[PDB]
Design a protein around this nucleic acid. Structure first.
Ligand SMILES: [Mg+2]
Ligand SMILES: [Zn+2]
Ligand SMILES: [Zn+2]
Lengths: 83, 1355, 99
RNA sequence: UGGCGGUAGCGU
DNA sequence: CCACGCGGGCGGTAGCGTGCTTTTTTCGATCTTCC
DNA sequence: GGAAGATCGAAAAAAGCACGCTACCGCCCGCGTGG
């Protein structure tokens, strides 16, 4: 359900970091076991990542901010567990 | 060891390192035993030296399991490890005698010869065991480096005893190299070069100094150039392929190694037995020949052949070459998950879709199907999945359908020329055995459905899939990267259908009806109550875009045709109705698509394109257009016309029978008459065809555009042209002989009617000419494309803005009489270099750094601005890459160019792709004197010194005078070059009308124009000695002619004639301009009618010097000449400085020119050939860059005399002229990028504080960095002169040795890098491709900059 | 003709060519040029190392695709190793710097 | 389930 | 009287000989300018 | 005052000669010695 990504590159810019962020998001869905926020109407990871880019929910900034938050919360949970 | 990969370091390999690499020593020339497959000990293939035979298994069977991994056996001494160890394990052959390396000996210049400073022939004779060389002759007459013959050696032995040392061969060379002192020779040569100041000593001594410095700086020793222990290839790299049966496939490398080992063993045996000197000498010579064969077969003489009676392959031969390992299995390699198949057209496919066969999809996506089946649980293991796949159930088909859902596949053509050659599609399962392809994209691939085969590749990783969805997609590729025009364009049946949907009749069924909307029009058409060509009135609700982008609907009762109403259904809600109310030709469709893309965007545009394709196909099918023999109407007058033409030619022929006219004039008149007859016939046929149909319209008859099918294809532009229809129903025309001469008689019969044998035979000449032209054109186009790609591989965008305030000039190109290209398209998409000022008001029309879009171009052209300074890649100050701002707007996408794009490859491919359009073969004069203007405008004279004449008309005295007709708006419209000594109708600033003769001048002679009025005094000319009063009986007068220098005496040639202007009294006029006396030095061979003591006014023609009164290059050869900077056969001599020109004494029968400056001394007394005419006079104040003589320009000369901007302008203008003459379009930025890559080397002028050598040539970026650093530290910066190099030469001279080796030349750059110890950083696209890491152009730019910042942080 | 996982050459460990030998399509030099013309870079690495001649890369790619994970290991092409070994077989001293 | 060269032909 | 071996070239008192084009080097022959 | 630096012109050598695809032919071998 995606044939033109012009509205996606206009959202991200430079047409290059969009590929990297979409690849990271698709890897998060596929091997990372993440939950696709947008509805999944029988599609695989890459187009869910592209549509999430389109809707503006995910970009580079939100992605690494969420990654840092997950890292710090899991570190806190681990240190609580060992203590 | 990927992190270990940062650079490649090469050098000469010492014998110690060679021994360290080897795991053993090969002794016997044997291979694996034929009786038993186990390899023989100490042979070419071995087990103790190299790795074992099978994984984790001992040769003797002591251990056969991983339990004893990494354990050395003792029964046979074979390491227990994997078989792959056989690929990185080497051995060493211990040569009995030293041998020279052949790359450092035969690859010119000879490194051994250059280092030893001896002739190559002497080195070769000494090396091959036939001539003797002295090592140390002592205090006797025998010098250090002296060549001795056998008899001379014996004589010296008896005369001077045994104190002198004269060895035999490579041992002597090695001893001499060891005895040489590097630093002492370096300093001695340095001081000799300092105090020699001789041109022959200027050269070949800097090279020696550079070689000495390279040897000293690196760890390489000269003696290492002489091989003593040689390495062998790992056994797996020269495998013995098991042929069918007991036969084993022969390997050339194995045979060569066996030969070398046998030779070494024989030499060892002979040395051990103390053989006579002759026998061991011959053995050493033939060992050297074997080493020649192994290192590089056929380099010296005959190549050692084998059972095939043809030369064998050694290391060097298959390292280099087209089939060599460097460019056959390294730069491009076969890949898995790939297929190929013939293609067919499919109309039911969307723009982003392709048709894949079921078998191809099943085979290509096999691992994905296996994984999905394993996930589904249908197959427990991989073997079960394989069995299910080969059984072809329905579940495997469903799994395949799920897999392909949004997995794009890449399709490409075998001759991928331009960037759009490969594109990805979303495949869909289809039946059949052929790949269904979208019709619109076919023109992108340049692939007609006549048997062409597509190749398909399948990405797997997520990054590759996103590349497929983002950049490989065809939807994103809408604008061409060469000129920005749309790549997808409706063509053929589609547009034809639209034509049939827009043509209007007069009495068609349903005329006069009034409909409420397109829906009722469709109802009426489908019900059969009306015809598509009927003219009606319908209520159209046009939706238009207003402020804030909102849609406003306006309903109006317009008058149109029902077919246009049907077409309006698929038009989106942004376009106006006027875009449809036309005849809908091909150009109309293209304009409508462009407007739709500009207004509504790409997303509606793709759907609109799909809809128009569907509608055009359907209505072309419904139209039922067909071609018939009756549709081909021959004009009735044509025959009559031919008759009269014959009559005409007969009359002309009669004149040649009467002697009134000559044969040449007869032929010319015949050609002109036949051309006029052809034009008349074509006009009559076109008038017949265009409006043949006559129709009743409820009354009297009336005319309308004809419905003839051939006329439909001609007018709609679907396929065919006016020339082809002229050949079809008019006449074939004047055909040409293969040499180029036009045949006297034309083909007077149509293609519809019969052609006689002679006319067909005549046409076959041109047919074969064109076919052979294309056949030979393909290869040259491919070679040029490869060279251009190699030249511009490194250039990528690395920065945003340079901040440089320097840019190239931009003015519309005018060749005289027409403007070939307006300013708008040449300056479109280029960032302005500086502020663009309004003409005459000193107001900032355009700011300093703005991207010039369409609105800015409209504003620029509205204010009548013709000159714009724009930033160019040539002036891009960024080193190792270009900035985004300097390059300008990307052609494919309207936005500014993004960082990282490898514009060099884009430029190379865009320039290469029209190569098939150009023609290489040369094709096939007219003389004009007076200049006539075409438009009416003001007149302007530039670089002009003019003198008034007796009649008051101006006369040009300047060589480089330019005449320009400028429009009333202030823009130049005409530009011509007026030669020296031309009369002018009017002065500067007077309005003139079109067609007026502005200037006239003598075609075959140059007059001598005096600036003063007075009597002429015959000074410094004497009859016979200097001039001859040659008597012309036809004129009846004896006119003085200036003799040639050889004709003149010594005093006569020294006393060349000098026309001095005096007054009536007799003293010199002395010129009003300057105080030096009025002297007009007559040049050689000048003929003067004027006699002594004749009064002449200012501007009078003193004398006339005759001159001679043809260059045909072509399309491809001219482009190759321009790009490789080949020196023209007749380079025009230009002044290196500004000063007075003077003649010197003739040297070797040729002329000496001296240019004396006003202040400095004359540096240049360069020699001039006598046969080459000189445009300049004896005494003229010529400026630097002016043409001393007339001839083709040399780009190197332009670079030395003038700035790099002049060279860039010249190259761009020439290449663009050649490209536009063929009709194709290429943007100038690609040519500018190629030129910038060409100008990358600079020669130092003064060393300064930098360490750069005085005469060395280095990269320009290094000079810039060094100068900036020195300025920062306050030291004086080194001065540089940019040099122009050929594209092949520039590519071969790059810093990266790997990229240079990837080019054509090999074993020359490799040898230079080895002797120089060059270290290559992986900073290029080609180098990284050879590596296999991510290229630093695309998405790998982020990874590469991340690596660079990580390295910087580590430092 | 179509191939997914066929045989490989002994010297370059590259897919064979020709329909009769069940080989693979050849990725020409102009194909690499066009790939660099676009911004695609991971696809070039796919064409170069993982899918052609990196035996460890080939095995890891096959195992990952079977497992469903579309992740990549760059590796080192074997053709470059072949060229390095052959150049070292002459008097040249091409090698690897430690950094 | 073994591919290395060469020769000829085919489509751009 | 067979198996290893060796060097592998046809042709011929040797020399690799035949309707492409461009670039680079070399060498002999000559023109010229001073020791 | 006539040799050495500069030039010129001819010779000789190196280097390449677009990309795919298809089919078949030769991948040993013939003459010379030691058991
Ligand atoms: Mg075709
Ligand atoms: Zn063992
Ligand atoms: Zn710049």
């Amino acid at each position: 359900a995606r044939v033109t990504v012009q509205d996606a590159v206009e959202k991200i810019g430079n047409r290059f970091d969009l590929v990297l962020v979409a690849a990271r998001r698709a890897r998060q869905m596929q091997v990372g076991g993440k939950d696709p926020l947008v509805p999944e109407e029988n599609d695989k990871t890459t187009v869910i990542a592209l549509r999430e880019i389109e809707e503006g929910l995910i970009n580079n900034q939100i992605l690494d901010v969420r990654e840092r938050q997950e890292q710090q919360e899991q570190e806190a949970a681990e240190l609580q567990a060992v203590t | 060891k990927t992190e270990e990969f940062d650079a490649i370091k090469i050098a000469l390999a010492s014998p110690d390192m060679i021994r360290s690499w080897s795991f053993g020593e090969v002794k016997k020339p044997e291979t694996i035993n034929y009786r038993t497959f186990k390899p023989e000990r100490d042979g070419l293939f071995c087990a103790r030296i190299f790795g074992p035979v099978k994984d984790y298994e001992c040769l003797c069977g002591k251990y056969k399991r991983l339990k004893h991994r990494g354990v050395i056996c003792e029964k046979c001494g074979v390491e227990v490890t994997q078989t792959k160890v056989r690929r990185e394990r080497m051995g060493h052959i211990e040569l009995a005698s030293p041998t020279a390396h052949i790359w450092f000996l035969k690859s010119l210049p000879s490194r051994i010869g250059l280092l030893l400073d001896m002739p190559l022939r002497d080195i070769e004779r000494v090396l091959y065991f036939e001539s003797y060389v002295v090592i140390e002759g002592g205090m006797t007459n025998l010098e250090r480096q002296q060549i001795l013959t056998e008899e001379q050696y014996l004589d010296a032995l008896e005369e001077f005893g045994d104190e002198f040392d004269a060895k035999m061969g490579a041992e002597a060379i090695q001893a001499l190299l060891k005895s040489m002192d590097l630093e002492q020779e370096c300093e001695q040569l340095r001081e000799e070069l300092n105090e020699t100041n001789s041109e022959t000593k200027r050269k070949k001594l800097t090279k020696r100094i550079k070689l000495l410095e390279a040897f000293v700086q690196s760890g390489n020793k000269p003696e290492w150039m002489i091989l003593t222990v040689l390495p062998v290839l790992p056994p797996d790299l020269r495998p013995l392929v098991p042929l069918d049966g007991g036969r084993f496939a022969t390997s050339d490398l194995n045979d060569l190694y066996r030969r070398v080992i046998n030779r070494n063993n024989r030499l060892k045996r002979l040395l051990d037995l103390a053989a006579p000197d002759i026998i061991v000498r011959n053995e050493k010579r033939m060992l050297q020949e074997a080493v020649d064969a192994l290192l590089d077969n056929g380099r010296r003489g005959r190549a050692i052949t084998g059972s095939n009676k043809r030369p064998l392959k050694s290391l060097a031969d298959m390292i280099k070459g087209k089939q060599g390992r460097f460019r056959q299995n390294l730069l491009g390699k076969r890949v898995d998950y790939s297929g190929r198949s013939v293609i067919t057209v499919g109309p039911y496919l969307r723009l982003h879709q392709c048709g894949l066969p079921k078998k191809m999809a099943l085979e290509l996506f096999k691992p994905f199907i296996y994984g999905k089946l394993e996930l589904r649980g249908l197959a427990t293991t991989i073997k079960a999945a394989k069995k299910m796949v080969e059984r072809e159930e329905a579940v495997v088909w469903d799994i395949l359908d799920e897999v392909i859902r949004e997995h794009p596949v890449l399709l490409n053509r075998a001759p991928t020329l331009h960037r759009l050659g490969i594109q990805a599609f979303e495949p869909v399962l289809i039946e059949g055995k052929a790949i269904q392809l979208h019709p619109l994209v076919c023109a992108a691939y340049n692939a007609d459905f006549d048997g062409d085969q597509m190749a398909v590749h399948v990405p797997l990783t997520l990054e590759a899939q996103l590349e497929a969805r983002a950049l490989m997609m065809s939807t994103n590729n809408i604008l061409s990267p060469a000129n920005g025009e749309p790549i997808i364009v409706p063509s053929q049946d589609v547009v034809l259908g639209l034509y049939y949907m827009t043509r209007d009749c007069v009495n068609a069924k349903g005329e006069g009806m009034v409909l409420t909307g397109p829906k009722e029009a469709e109802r009426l058409y489908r019900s059969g109550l009306a015809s598509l060509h009927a003219r009606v009135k319908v209520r159209i609700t046009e939706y238009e875009k207003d402020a804030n982008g909102e849609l406003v609907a306006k309903t109006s009762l317009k008058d149109t045709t029902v077919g246009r109403a049907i077409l309006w259904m698929i038009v989106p809600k942004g376009l106006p109705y006027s875009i449809v109310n036309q005849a809908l030709g091909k150009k109309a469709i293209s304009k409508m698509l462009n407007t739709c893309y500009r207004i509504l965007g790409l997303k509606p545009t793709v759907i609109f394109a799909d809809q128009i394709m569907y509608t055009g196909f359907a209505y072309a099918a419904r139209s039922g257009a067909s071609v018939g023999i009756d549709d081909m109407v021959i004009p009735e007058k044509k025959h009559e016309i031919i008759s009269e033409a014959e009559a005409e030619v007969a009359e002309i022929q009669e004149q040649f029978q009467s002697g009134l006219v000559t044969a040449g004039e007869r032929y010319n008149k015949v050609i002109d008459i036949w051309a006029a007859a052809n034009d008349r016939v074509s006009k009559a046929m076109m008038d017949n065809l265009q409006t043949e149909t006559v129709i009743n319209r409820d009354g009297q008859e009336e005319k309308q555009v004809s419905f003839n099918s051939i006329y439909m294809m001609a007018d709609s532009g679907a396929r065919g042209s006016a020339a082809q229809i002229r050949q079809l129903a008019g006449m074939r025309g004047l055909m040409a002989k293969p040499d180029g001469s036009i045949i006297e008689t034309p083909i007077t019969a149509n293609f519809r009617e019969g052609l006689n044998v002679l006319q067909y035979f005549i046409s076959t000449h041109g047919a074969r000419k064109g076919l052979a032209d294309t056949a030979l054109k393909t290869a040259n186009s491919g070679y040029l494309t490869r060279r251009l790609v190699d030249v511009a591989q490194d250039l990528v965008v690395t920065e945003d803005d340079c901040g440089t305030h320097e840019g190239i000039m931009m003015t519309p190109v005018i060749e005289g009489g027409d403007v070939k290209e307006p300013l708008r398209d040449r300056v479109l998409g280029r960032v302005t270099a500086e502020d663009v000022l309004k003409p005459g008001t000193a107001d900032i029309l355009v700011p300093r750094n703005t991207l010039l879009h369409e609105q800015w171009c409209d504003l620029l052209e509205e204010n009548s601005v013709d000159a714009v300074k724009v930033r160019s890649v040539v002036s891009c100050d960024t080193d190792f890459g270009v900035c985004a701002h300097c390059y300008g707007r990307d052609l494919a996408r309207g936005h500014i160019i993004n960082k990282g794009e490898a514009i060099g490859v884009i430029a190379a491919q865009s320039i290469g792709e029209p190569g098939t359009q150009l023609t290489m073969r040369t094709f096939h004069a007219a003389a004009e004197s007076s200049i006539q203007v075409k438009n009416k405008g003001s007149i302007k004279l530039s670089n002009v010194k003019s003198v008034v004449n007796s009649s008051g008309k101006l006369v040009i005295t300047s060589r480089n005078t330019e005449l320009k007709l400028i429009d009333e708006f202030g823009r130049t419209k005409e530009s011509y070059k007026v030669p020296y000594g031309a009369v002018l109708a009017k002065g500067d600033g007077e309005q003139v009308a079109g067609g007026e003769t502005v200037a006239n001048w003598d075609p075959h002679t140059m007059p001598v124009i005096t600036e003063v009025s007075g009597f002429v005094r015959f000074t410094d000319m004497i009859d016979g000695q200097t001039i001859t009063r040659q008597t012309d009986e036809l004129t009846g007068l004896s006119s003085l002619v200036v003799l040639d220098s050889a004709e003149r005496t010594a005093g006569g040639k020294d006393l060349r004639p000098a026309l001095k202007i005096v007054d009536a009294q007799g003293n010199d006029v002395l010129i009003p301009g300057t105080d030096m006396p009025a002297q007009y030095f007559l040049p050689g061979k000048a003929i003067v009618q004027l006699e002594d003591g004749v009064q002449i006014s200012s501007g009078d023609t003193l004398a006339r010097i005759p001159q001679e009164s043809k260059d045909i290059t072509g399309g491809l050869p001219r482009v190759a000449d321009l790009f490789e900077a080949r020196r023209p056969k007749e380079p025009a001599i230009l002044a290196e400085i500004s000063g007075i020109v003077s003649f010197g004494k003739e040297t070797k029968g040729k002329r000496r020119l001296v240019i004396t400056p006003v202040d400095g001394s004359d540096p240049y007394e360069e020699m001039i050939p006598k046969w080459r005419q000189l445009n300049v006079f004896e005494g003229e104040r010529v400026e630097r860059g002016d043409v001393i003589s007339d001839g083709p320009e040399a780009p190197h000369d332009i670079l030395r005399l003038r700035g790099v901007h002049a060279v860039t302008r010249y190259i761009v203008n020439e290449v663009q002229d050649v490209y536009r003459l063929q009709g194709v379009k290429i943007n100038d930025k690609h040519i500018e990028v190629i030129v910038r890559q060409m100008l990358r080397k600079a020669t130092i002028v003064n060393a300064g504080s930098s360490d750069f050598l005085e005469g060395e040539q280095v990269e320009y970026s290094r000079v810039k960095i060094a100068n900036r650093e020195l300025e920062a530290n306050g030291k004086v910066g080194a001065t540089y002169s940019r040099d122009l190099l050929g594209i092949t030469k520039a590519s071969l001279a790059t810093e990266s040795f790997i990229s240079a080796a990837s080019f054509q030349e090999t074993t020359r750059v490799l040898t230079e890098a080895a002797v120089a110890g060059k270290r290559d950083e992986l900073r290029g696209l080609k180098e990284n491709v050879i590596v296999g890491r991510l290229i630093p152009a695309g998405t790998g730019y982020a990874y590469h900059q991340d690596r660079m910042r990580r390295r910087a942080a580590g430092e | 003709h179509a191939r997914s996982t066929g045989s490989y050459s002994l010297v370059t460990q590259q897919p064979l060519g020709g329909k009769a030998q069940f080989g693979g399509q050849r990725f020409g030099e102009m194909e690499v040029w066009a790939l660099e013309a676009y911004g695609a870079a991971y696809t070039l690495q796919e064409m170069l190392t993982v899918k052609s001649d990196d035996v460890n890369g080939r095995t890891k790619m096959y195992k990952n695709i079977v497992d469903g994970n579309h992740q990549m290991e760059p590796g080192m092409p074997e053709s470059f190793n072949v060229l390095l070994k052959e150049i070292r077989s002459l008097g040249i001293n091409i090698e690897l710097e430690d950094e």
